[PDB]
């Protein structure tokens, strides 16, 4: 949930394959923004009674509470779309099943996870763990001609001009942040953190619970930062500065690994296959975490209760439709379904202000709340400024 996310891969890799090491700042500043924003939700959940979804509901009337629910629920679907595309592409590379058919299979991948269920819930992740590590080892190995400072000269050391000027870099920049700061994790983390061991009503030493939770929230977020940098490096190394200007999608990475000279042919074919299985593996883990988050949002805003398997079906059904419509319109174009993938993360950018602002208001009222709301207010205004600028410059 940060490195096994196809939304993270496609944005970072095309962010390097098209614009070099420029967007490395955006990775850093968003990963840092994620650390801080997640810590606020952690506090919000442990301090106040319950999570962000119901907290937002307590301040809004039902009409505007549904509008907030709509925006939030769409962000959950947008993430699911990312998995649908990711799994469809994976099935196309491995089994040769066309994207239009693969997307249809994703409705019943839910059913496939129960086939994995009775084979060890620990047994399989160990294979996936080695799978991810092996694939990541390939990616690390696939980094040559690496200038030890040309990274730095744009990594963190911000070239803040093109990042906001032309739509191209700005578009990917929004996708990168939206994929690293996922709006549905704010609602999820603000409730799952209340499962830790501490006295609910009276004891304030639950700051210890916040202590552990924030440290854990910064650990995995650091790894996500490393991977995103590792993946942007990968795309830049392989596809950036080319005469043909490859966008650098999953298909490009597949044939880059499969046709890498030093990597051989038969050996290179294994690497590409392992990547495809890892891409498939990136899906089924994401849908479980996304389903629990959907429960919180719906029960928080609408105060409506339906079983997870049902909402897992409804959310998936709604996610496959725009994927299929996209495949029908552009006649199954693989580069076009990857644009929908990137766009799904750019939408997460649009939905963020509707989640960050309520998080802000709660964090400035009831005890144990933060000293400088300064670092958090400049984030929202600069955020809505950009998503509207892009939202207007395109339109």
């Amino acid at each position, epitope marked *: 949930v940060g490195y096994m996310d196809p939304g993270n891969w496609i944005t970072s890799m095309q962010g390097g394959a098209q614009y070099g090491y420029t967007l490395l700042f955006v990775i850093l500043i968003s990963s840092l923004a994620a650390m801080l924003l997640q810590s606020m939700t952690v506090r919000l959940g442990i301090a106040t009674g319950k999570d962000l979804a119901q907290m937002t509901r307590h301040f809004l009337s039902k009409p505007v509470a549904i509008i907030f629910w709509i925006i939030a629920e769409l962000a959950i679907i947008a993430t699911d779309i990312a998995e649908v595309i990711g799994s469809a592409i994976a099935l196309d590379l491995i089994f040769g099943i066309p994207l239009i058919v693969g997307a249809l299979i994703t409705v019943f991948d839910v059913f496939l996870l129960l086939f994995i269920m009775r084979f060890g819930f620990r047994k399989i992740e160990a294979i996936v763990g080695t799978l991810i590590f092996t694939v990541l080892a390939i990616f690390v190995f696939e980094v040559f001609i690496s200038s030890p400072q040309l990274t730095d000269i744009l990594n963190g050391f911000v070239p803040h001009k093109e990042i906001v000027t032309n739509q191209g870099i700005l578009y990917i920049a929004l996708g990168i942040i939206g994929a690293t700061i996922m709006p549905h994790n704010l609602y999820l983390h603000s409730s799952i953190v209340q499962s830790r061991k501490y006295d609910r009503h009276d004891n304030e030493e639950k700051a210890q619970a916040i202590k552990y939770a924030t440290i854990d929230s910064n650990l995995q977020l650091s790894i996500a930062f490393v991977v995103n940098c590792l993946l942007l490096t990968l795309g830049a190394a392989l596809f950036f500065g080319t005469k043909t200007n490859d966008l650098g999608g999953f298909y490009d990475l597949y044939h880059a690994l499969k046709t890498e000279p030093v990597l051989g*042919a038969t050996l290179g074919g294994v690497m590409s296959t392992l990547f495809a299985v890892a891409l498939l593996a990136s899906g089924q883990n994401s849908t479980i975490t996304g389903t629990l988050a959907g429960q919180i949002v719906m029960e928080g805003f609408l105060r409506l209760s339906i079983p997870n398997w049902l909402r897992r079906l409804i959310t998936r059904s709604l996610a496959v439709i725009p994927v299929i419509i996209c495949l029908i319109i552009f006649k199954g174009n693989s580069e076009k379904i990857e644009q929908l993938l990137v766009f799904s993360q750019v939408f997460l950018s649009i939905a963020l202000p509707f989640s960050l602002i309520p998080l802000q208001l709660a964090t400035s009222n009831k005890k144990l709340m933060g000293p400088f709301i300064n670092k958090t207010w400049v984030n929202i205004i600069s955020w809505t400024l950009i998503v509207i600028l892009s939202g207007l410059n395109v339109y």
Partner: nanobody, 120 residues
């Protein structure tokens, strides 16, 4: 690296066929592809053309019936031939711009044609 063709053969008018254009070894990308044909006693004719961005165009004699497409996963260019007429009979060739690796310059490749016979 050689361009290999398949999927042809014998079929009745009204039937359909699907030609396959792949390379002998692993390729990074087929940037451009052309499907030529040559009926008995006639000239070599361009039938289908697919571009890098995916757009395609067909001869007026074959448009609406033929469909060229790229399988990015397997780097294969297909020619879906539907509602075949007896005059579609001939030898079909595959011209394609193969890119061996990512940064390798795009070379032009041809291939030994395959026989397509629409009978009766």
């Amino acid at each position: 690296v050689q361009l290999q063709e398949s999927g042809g053969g014998l079929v009745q008018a009204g039937g359909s066929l699907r030609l396959s254009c792949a390379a002998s070894r692993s390729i990074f990308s087929i940037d451009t592809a052309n499907w030529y044909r040559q009926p008995p006693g006639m000239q070599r004719e361009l039938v289908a053309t697919i571009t890098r961005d995916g757009n395609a165009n067909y001869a007026d004699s074959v448009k609406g019936r033929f469909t060229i497409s790229r399988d990015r996963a397997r780097n294969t260019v297909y020619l879906q031939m539907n509602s075949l007429k007896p005059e579609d009979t001939g030898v079909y060739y595959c011209n394609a711009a193969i890119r061996t690796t990512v940064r390798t310059s795009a070379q032009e490749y041809w291939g030994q044609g395959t026989q397509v016979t629409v009978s009766s």
